[PDB]
Design a protein around this nucleic acid. Structure first.
Ligand SMILES: [Mg+2]
Lengths: 57, 58
DNA sequence: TGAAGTGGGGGCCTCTTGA
DNA sequence: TCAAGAGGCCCCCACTTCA
């Protein structure tokens, strides 16, 4: 049936995620929530981005 | 069918567990493994004892 | 009695998918 | 492409269960 499409993170969102990754490979529960607010993404999305980022690297 | 029995912890083991609990309500994996080794219990039993002790503390 | 089971949070890691 | 699915394994709290 119809399903929700994956939406790519913008250049700005990716830049900030990367900028933060350069300072911390792992984020605590509070930090994820905060960054998710700054990026306008969900806590989970930030959590998974870091997870895939640690894996990719 | 027959299933493994629940074995109680000795007075000495519980005494040491209650001693550590008065020092820390929670333990890290290294702390849980070192205590398990000392008491002759697995790390899961220790983990589960602190979990239960906390619930009962409520 | 009281350690252990059930089940519902989250989490990290690892590999793979497919609009 | 690349965020997300999903198996494998961990810690926590609530609330029982029954040798
Ligand atoms: Mg796409």
């Amino acid at each position: 049936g119809r399903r929700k499409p994956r939406v790519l993170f913008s250049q700005a969102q990716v830049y900030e995620l990367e900028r933060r990754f350069k300072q911390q490979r792992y984020l605590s529960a509070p930090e994820r929530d905060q960054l998710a607010s700054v990026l306008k993404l969900t806590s989970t999305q930030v959590k998974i981005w870091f997870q895939n980022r640690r894996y990719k690297s």
